[PDB]
Amino acid sequence: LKETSAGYITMHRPGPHAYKSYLEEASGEVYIKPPSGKNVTYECKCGDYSTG
Amino acid sequence: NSVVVSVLNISATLGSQAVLPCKSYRMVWTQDRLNDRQRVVHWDVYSTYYGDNKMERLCDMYSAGDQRVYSSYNQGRIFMPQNAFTDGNFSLVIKDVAESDGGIYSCNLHHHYCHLYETVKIQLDVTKKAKAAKEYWDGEKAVIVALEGSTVMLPCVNRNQIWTERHSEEEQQVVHWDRQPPGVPHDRADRLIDLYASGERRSYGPLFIRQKMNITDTAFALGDFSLRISELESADEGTYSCHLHHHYCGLHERRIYQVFVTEPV
Amino acid sequence: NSVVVSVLNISATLGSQAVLPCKSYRMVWTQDRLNDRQRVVHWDVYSTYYGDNKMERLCDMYSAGDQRVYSSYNQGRIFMPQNAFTDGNFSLVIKDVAESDGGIYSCNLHHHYCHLYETVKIQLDVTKKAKAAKEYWDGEKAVIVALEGSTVMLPCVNRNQIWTERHSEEEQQVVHWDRQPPGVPHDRADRLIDLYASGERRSYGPLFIRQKMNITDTAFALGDFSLRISELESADEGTYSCHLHHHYCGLHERRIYQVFVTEPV
After folding, report:
1. Which of A1, A4, A5 is facing B169, going by the closest CB pair?
2. Where is this protein found (chain A) (predicted)?
3. Strands C251-259 and C3-10
4. What is the dihedral angle through the alpha carbons of B189, B194, B197, B199, rounded to the nearest 10 degrees?
5. Are C61 and C43 in contact (CB under 8 A)?
6. How many Cα atoms sit within 13 Å of C96 on the Cβ side?
7. In chain A, what residues touch C4 (CB-CB under 8 Å)?
8. What gap in Å lies between CA B168 and CA B173, rounded to an integer?
9. Which residues of A, range 12-51, sit inside 8 Å of B by Cβ?
10. Shortest CA distance to B143 belongs to which of B110, B105, B181?
11. Hey, which residues does B229 pair with through a beta bridge?
């Protein structure tokens, strides 16, 4: 029976995630192409921990 | 197939609010996450021979449980066949009977989940001479007469499907509020709303009428399936039916209300 | 996704023969039935302290091989973690450092099948006083200073997918010669011919043009995928693209040639 009265399992929000397709580097200069219609963050450390 | 609990004529007034009280606290659904899955039977003697003249429980069987004797003596004296729990023959056996043992016996069944209980009454007597030792049936009770110290049997069998083991999966207790369209005979209704024991509700037809067809959110729990129809319209005219079925307890009932829209007067 | 190696405008003349030199001897495919499936890394020191002032190889790791020390002493002194072969941290450890041990170190990677190799340069120095014992980074090299006999570490990590273990099935190196039809923008070509590392060639379109579209039969082997188009026609007018991809080595490149048919003048 679906009804259950035992056990206890935690549940929490997720962490960050990674991908390559967001970043394209065919040319010498960097290129980032996030999927259309989706907010995205990006980070780089050269010089400083700069994020956009 | 359900059985018509009662038929009532409802003189619902157009525009006003009408109430169909279909409900039963017996149908109430257990709130705790652990719905009771056990049933109990017991034997209790009320022997007026005792100056205390109280009722004392000889023993009790718990479903899927272990036989347990209340006192330290009835073990051996009291025999409750374990297999009989499936047979339903909840009979009692006494090895030796004393002058202080004769009295009034009662076999009782209790079930928390189904909220159904029963009791059956018997009489026991003991005499020094076996000549008068003969059972008889009084319609409302049975009288046993036997020699002192002689083995005696008291029968308690119900022969009921609910009280015999059936590990059936707990089907949600279906509740259906179905309205016969205007100018339509009974038994031809289309389900206005459906309610499950799990609390999920399936709505049919317009949403505004369902909202005005006020039903307490705890109806599946409290069992208050009474239908409160507000802002009555001519479309709502027609007979209403409140069907309830509980597979585990095996109950099946229906309430029919002749709801006709009447203009204000 | 491939990367445009170069874009060249081709003034192909009608009737004459035009050549698209898309090719790379790096792309050459191994001829022997046993294509190389192993890669090597090694460490080599060029210490000018030696009067011989030659470069001597401390040790070398072979893919799926066993650690082997060139000399009889570096064992124990030189530590190359076997698990690091998967990590790619091809670092070196010295237990004790002598005045004759300081010099120039170089970590080198060689791969016969992919024909890709790399080298990284480092400097090591030893002093009697730990006060001056401090590393520094010169951009083109790193200088290490440490006390004589002190354990020292030299890092060589590339963090590259090719140099880390990947037992991927050897997908045939796809080569595609695709021509944009006349009056069509780039990236809209239909494959004129396809070439596999196994040597099989898939022809598309007329057979006569494929025959006149001369390609060396050993192109899959030599890598000379240059396209020689003969008896140029107006139909052949349009941009040409030469795409190459090697899954095992992970290479992906494309060469675009603006081939327009020009009448003789």
Report:
1. A1
2. Host cell membrane; Host cytoplasm; Host nucleus; Virion membrane
3. parallel
4. -160
5. no
6. 5
7. 26
8. 13
9. none
10. B105
11. B18, B213
